[PDB]
């Protein structure tokens, strides 16, 4: 996947897939849906499914929630309060163990991020009255920092892959909806049907 600050964005349309098989699996660590009950995903359906995928730290899964604090929750990704979707997180320590130093996270920014804002930029952050130019020194910091994903780290430091799903309540003709079940057929019987 992509970086935590530059989260991967995917749009899904014109497909029919089951959502019950997701939570039924024995591999999902955290599965919290806010806009709808987890067991009623198959019953209902929406439009304009959006998927956000990234990797965060082990002890920061609680930051991804409507109306919370945190440096990552304010300078890397912030969920709007009026959010109708679900969040899935699972362990991926063996995928990044030696160990991983290609990950960067944002820590310094002038203001909090806007909802669903893809703020990608680089600049020497200023923390002093005097102007900053040339090379980084005092009050001149690099907003991105690396992860110490050492393989010998227990809970709280292992990388977790997080996928956030969002949907819209039918602003257009329906394109994606849950699969339906078809039974058998009979003959020479007084039968009512919908077909």
């Amino acid at each position: 996947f992509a970086s935590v600050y530059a989260w991967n964005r995917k749009r899904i349309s014109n497909c029919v897939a089951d959502y019950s098989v997701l939570y039924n699996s024995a591999s999902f660590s955290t599965f919290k849906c806010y806009g709808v009950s987890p067991t009623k995903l198959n019953d209902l359906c929406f439009t304009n499914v959006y998927a956000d995928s990234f990797v965060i730290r082990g002890d920061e899964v609680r930051q991804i929630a409507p109306g919370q604090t945190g440096k990552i929750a304010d300078y890397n990704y912030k969920l709007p309060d009026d959010f109708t979707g679900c969040v899935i997180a699972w362990n991926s320590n063996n995928l990044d163990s030696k160990g991983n130093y290609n990950y960067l996270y944002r820590l310094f920014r002038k203001s909090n991020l806007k909802p669903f804002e893809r703020d990608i930029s680089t600049e020497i952050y200023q923390a002093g009255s005097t102007p900053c130019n040339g090379v980084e020194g005092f009050n001149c910091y690099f907003p991105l920092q690396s992860y110490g994903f050492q393989p010998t780290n227990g809970v709280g430091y292992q990388p977790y892959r997080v996928v956030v799903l969002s949907f819209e309540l039918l602003h257009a003709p329906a394109t994606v909806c849950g699969p339906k079940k078809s039974t058998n057929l009979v003959k020479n019987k007084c039968v009512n049907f919908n077909f």
Partner: antibody
Amino acid sequence: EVQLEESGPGLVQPSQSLSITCTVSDFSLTTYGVHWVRQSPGKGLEWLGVIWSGGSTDYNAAFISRLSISKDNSKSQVFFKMNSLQTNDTAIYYCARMGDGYYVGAMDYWGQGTSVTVSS
Amino acid sequence: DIQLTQSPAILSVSPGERVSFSCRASQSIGTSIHWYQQRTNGSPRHLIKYASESISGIPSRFSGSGSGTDFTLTINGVESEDIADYYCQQGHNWPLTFGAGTKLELKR
């Protein structure tokens, strides 16, 4: 006013399997996990496994291949099944809920366990 | 795996005096330690989490100190109700383990 209760004592022989029922009430199990810890006579507390509402199952290193944990939110019941009963399996098994915070810790309260007796 | 050693097996002291219980770890764990109190015919009760903050409903006499491999649970003016076995629990590694278990004994 949350409370946590388990099943009764077990009268088993070393050979077969057994199931332990852990039931929660007065709080939503769909938002917190469940921990299982055993305590043999003359031995300290040993954690067996933890189940999370997101369908996550974690087991101890020594009991990875001999444990089965199931959750049912319809009646808020946790089923703890183990196999390969041995003489040392005679112990007290505690079931408890998962607290908010970090993965290790967040131990607010617990529940009284069952006394399993294994003999020939 | 990691192991935890308690300070003394059984500590004898009168109620009302300063007491301290020690838990030692073979590997540095930062602050991922916890202290529990188990009484007779009773399961352990959580006293201190992370050796830095207390638990709601716990008397203020209980306190925690130390980091890394050494942790100390200190009680100001031990009372009769506090005469019980104590446990230290570690969770830095994936398999969480408990300490040997120190027992508090009355002196009178």
